[PDB]
């Protein structure tokens, strides 16, 4: 009798994005039990009796366990939901644990080799199994529980008909004696899917609607797969659920009483607008940098008032390509420098957005107001570790002079943060992985004095508005003043050199607009005169 | 049997100022339970099992949860008041968690997909559901309860007949695995109302008085709605209660013996003087403002002794206008400077008072005597955090040189 149900199919279990992991598990676990017995006996090997799954929330471990339980032809599995074993009386947790292995021992002692398989599932296993000698209170029962489990899985008596599965979110808190070969051999990590896995999941979760003709013809799954970046399977299912709810709500009226049409409920369709609306207002991922960040960091967009705006972007593109391709320099660095109010943060964010790497992050001082030195170092270290775990990553560090608390009087600054930055600027990730670092500053001489300017690979300059033609082009691209007023302005600016930042010009224009319609250009020109210059 | 009660009406709930939130909750949580079952079966979609409400104190979270519980044709809900499950014996505080789900499991296993709905309410949820430490030697006091709850809400055995509701004031301390789209998928903020909501609440709380001709006719609700800026739903009810108490007290004499003139109690009516007296002496808001602080900072008035005063006031008015009417520049700042004893703080206070914004606050060193720099940073951050919860705000920073602890010798200051 085979251990696999006759009516089993891999497409029946409805898991997408985990083909490789399932292949590895099947090879390492069930290969011996399906192969003919005589040759296996001639080999003289024992079977595997342990699996451990770990990963972040919402990625599909319990689904794997349930489907594996349904796949095999054996008794109904035993499942332990968290810390169900604990009891108030002495010797009663260990008895609860010993009750889980009785039938396996009985059948092994009776039928010997020709016996069926017994499955046990441990959910939230980190609650009951932790390193021995780490709890200050109530450890007396915990260590005894761990010892009983260890003695039961692998002891003087030998069993050959048990399989144990565990799932956890905190793999580093588990006892090491439990993870050695012979007890829990196959360790698997479940992580976020890529675009093809997302497409597979999105196809899985719409098959019935497509079959029953309840899905509109303007919905394109590939666009959704491209659009839903950083999502997990649970979020991908929630998005579809939200779209279905939005579609349903158009046939229910609830003002005084609740009523359903029941005539237009037939001919229900799910359109693309429902999907778009949900993506905007309902579901938001919990990983990486999303639209809410780019909205804040680039508030008024990017306008091409001159030539350097394209030069900066071209240099950024070249650096990104170099990071992507080169293999002898996995780590690259660059510094954006210029006078104040020039727009360095927005350009850095734009370049990072155009990079299109899987991992992007922004480290800014406005998220750590009031922190001490140690907290800042810890935050930076955590962000860089998260960057390291990926394959190809990008990181942005803006307002360096604010990250280290610099004041000209003194001077005064934080040495700990400076040393941490200097160490991090020259550390490479694990082999086969690549990282790009972008930095912004407004005081280059101070960084030169501290000997940080030699830890960067290159630098890029970001200039100000220098001539009246560029000023008039910017005014044209903003559309604040009409042609009649712009003629008067050109009568004054073209015969002079200007020195103004992009961020200051918007403030000047909004201050000028408050005057009456007669005194607008006059106030604008007075403020521009007050600005002065210092190239 | 329909899930909704046959006699339910939206207007009987008694909730004013939160139409959009209720619409969203109804669409996301109850739409699939009211639609015909055959079509829902053709879609292969599960029901939502979780809701979270968060916001500042006094805005209507417990009332909303109670009304939701009352509107459904189901069993009597289960209520958990704070840390009511904690016990001292080992393994006993998790059996309490497991006991909350027994009937749902039994009825599921018995009746399949024809079972009813089971509601569970968690009040002060953050008391028992903080983040797990996830570091050796830094394990939390009770992470077994969190594990049990996580395993019970979403586990190997599947339930489709439960709904969980929670309420909190500190949403940033909850565990991350509890808030994912499979456990508590709908998350809503309950904040301060605007003028329309204030008018609705006042109508709700004055309808019964108006029914029995117990309310005078010099009373205008639309005037009260304008006069009460940045009030919560509880403060308006307190104001009405105080006005009623003032009206009632006029017919009682206390001293030797308590006696009620049960002849004039028939011609009892609540007037516009009671409301005015209450606004002045009884109720003081939290995100609003009162006139005493201005009297503290503008002590001897302001007199026009020359031209500069008018110039300063006009300059302030123009920046108030720009900050109110500008979209490209949501943030603007200005600095007032001059020689000592020239009267700049009073001018700043006058400009802030004349802005007419709903939220106005003053940050002063007079309230930070003996503080360390960490405490000063925390206080400033707290002041600035309250202002982000308003549509229009103005903040005044006084005596910047005293805030930094500057002395010319050395010099010395707080970086």
């Amino acid at each position: 009798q085979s251990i696999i149900n006759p009516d089993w199919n891999f497409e029946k279990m409805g898991i997408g994005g985990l083909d490789k992991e399932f292949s590895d598990i099947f090879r390492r676990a069930f290969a011996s039990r399906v192969f003919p017995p005589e040759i296996v006996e001639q080999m003289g090997c024992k079977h595997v009796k342990g699996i451990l799954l770990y990963g972040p929330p919402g990625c599909g471990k319990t689904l794997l366990a349930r489907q594996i339980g349904k796949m095999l032809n054996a008794r109904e599995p035993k499942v332990v939901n968290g810390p169900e074993i604990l009891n108030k009386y002495v010797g009663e947790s260990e008895a609860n644990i010993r009750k889980l292995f009785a039938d396996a021992e009985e059948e092994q002692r009776r039928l010997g080799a020709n016996s069926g398989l017994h499955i046990i599932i441990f959910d939230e296993i980190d609650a009951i199994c932790k390193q021995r000698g780490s709890m200050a209170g109530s450890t007396g029962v915990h260590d005894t529980v761990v010892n009983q489990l260890l003695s039961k899985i692998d002891g003087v008596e030998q069993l050959n008909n048990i399989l144990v599965i565990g799932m956890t979110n905190r793999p580093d808190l588990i006892d090491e004696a439990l993870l050695r070969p012979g007890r829990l051999e196959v360790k698997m990590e479940i992580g976020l899917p890529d675009e093809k896995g997302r497409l597979q999941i999105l196809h899985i979760h719409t098959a019935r609607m497509r079959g029953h003709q309840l899905l509109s013809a303007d919905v394109d799954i590939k666009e959704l797969a491209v659009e839903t970046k950083n999502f997990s399977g649970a979020e991908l299912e929630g998005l579809v659920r939200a779209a279905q709810s939005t579609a349903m709500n158009r046939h229910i009226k609830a003002s005084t009483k609740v009523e359903v049409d029941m005539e237009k409920a037939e001919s229900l369709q799910v359109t693309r607008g429902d999907f778009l609306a949900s993506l905007e207002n309902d579901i938001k991922p919990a990983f990486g940098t999303n639209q809410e960040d780019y909205a804040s960091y680039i508030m008024n967009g990017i306008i091409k008032w001159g030539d350097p705006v394209t030069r900066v972007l071209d240099d950024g593109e070249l650096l990104v390509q170099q990071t992507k391709n080169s293999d002898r320099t996995p780590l690259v660095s660059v510094l954006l420098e210029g006078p104040p109010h020039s727009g360095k943060t927005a350009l850095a964010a734009k370049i990072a957005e155009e990079s299109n790497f899987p991992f992007i992050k922004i480290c800014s001082p406005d998220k750590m107001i009031g922190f001490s030195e140690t907290a800042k170092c810890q935050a930076m270290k955590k962000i860089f570790d998260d960057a390291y775990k990926s394959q190809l990553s990008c990181v942005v560090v803006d307002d360096i002079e604010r990250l280290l608390d610099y004041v000209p009087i003194g001077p005064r600054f934080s040495n700990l943060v400076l040393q941490a930055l200097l160490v991090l600027l020259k550390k490479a990730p694990p082999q086969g992985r690549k990282l790009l670092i972008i930095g912004t500053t407004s005081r280059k001489d101070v960084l030169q004095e501290m000997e940080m300017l030699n830890a960067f690979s290159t630098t890029i300059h970001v200039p100000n508005i220098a001539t009246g033609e560029q000023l008039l082009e910017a005014l044209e691209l903003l559309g604040n003043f009409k042609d009649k007023e712009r003629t008067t302005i050109a009568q004054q600016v073209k015969g002079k050199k200007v020195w103004i930042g992009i961020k200051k010009l918007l403030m000047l224009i909004e201050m000028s607009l408050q005057m009456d319609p007669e005194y607008r250009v006059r106030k604008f020109l007075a403020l521009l005169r007050e600005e002065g210059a210092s190239p | 049997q329909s899930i909704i009660n046959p006699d339910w009406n939206f207007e009987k709930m008694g909730i004013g100022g939160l139409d959009k939130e209720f619409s969203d909750i109804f669409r996301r949580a109850f739409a699939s339970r009211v639609f015909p079952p055959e079509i829902v079966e053709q879609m292969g979609c599960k029901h939502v099992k979780g809701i979270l409400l968060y916001g500042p104190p006094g805005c209507g979270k417990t009332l909303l949860a109670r009304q939701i519980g009352k509107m459904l044709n189901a069993r009597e809900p289960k209520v958990v008041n704070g840390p009511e499950i904690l016990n001292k014996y080992v393994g006993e505080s998790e059996a309490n968690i497991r006991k909350l789900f027994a009937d749902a499991e039994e009825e599921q296993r018995r009746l399949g997909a024809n079972s009813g709905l089971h509601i569970i309410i968690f009040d002060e949820i953050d008391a028992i559901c903080k983040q797990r430490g996830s570091m050796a030697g830094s394990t939390g006091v009770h992470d077994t309860v969190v594990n049990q709850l996580l395993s019970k809400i979403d586990g190997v055995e599947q339930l489709n007949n439960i709904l969980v509701i929670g309420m909190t004031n500190r949403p940033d301390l909850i565990d991350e695995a509890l808030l994912r789209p499979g456990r508590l998928e709908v998350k809503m903020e309950i904040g301060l109302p605007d003028e329309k909501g204030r008018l609705q609440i006042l109508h709700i709380h004055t309808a019964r008085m108006r029914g029995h001709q117990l309310l005078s006719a010099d009373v205008d609700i639309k005037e009260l709605a304008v006069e009460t800026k940045n009030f919560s739903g509880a403060e308006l009810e307190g104001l009405v209660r105080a006005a009623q108490s003032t009206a009632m007290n006029r017919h009682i004499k206390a001293s030797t013996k308590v006696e009620v003139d049960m002849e004039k109690a028939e011609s009892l009516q609540v007037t516009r003087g009671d409301f005015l007296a209450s606004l002045e002496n009884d109720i003081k808001p939290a995100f609003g403002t009162n006139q005493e602080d201005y009297a503290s900072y503008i002590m001897n008035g302001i007199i026009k002794w020359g031209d500069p005063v008018t110039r300063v006031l006009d300059d302030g008015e123009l920046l108030v206008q720009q900050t109110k009417n500008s979209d490209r520049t949501p943030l603007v700042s200005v600095l007032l400077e001059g020689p000592p004893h020239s009267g700049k703080t009073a001018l700043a206070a006058k400009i802030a008072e004349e802005s007419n914004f709903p939220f106005i606050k003053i940050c002063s060193p007079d309230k930070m005597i003996g503080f360390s720099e960490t405490a000063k940073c925390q206080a400033m951050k707290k002041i600035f955090d309250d202002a982000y919860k308003s549509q229009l705000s103005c903040v005044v920073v006084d005596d910047i040189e005293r805030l930094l602890d500057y002395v010319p010798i050395g010099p010395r200051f707080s970086n």
Partner: peptide, 16 residues
Amino acid sequence: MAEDADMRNELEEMQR
């Protein structure tokens, strides 16, 4: 100083 935290208990049974 900080006051020692709260602690759990174990129990023992007796026959008659």
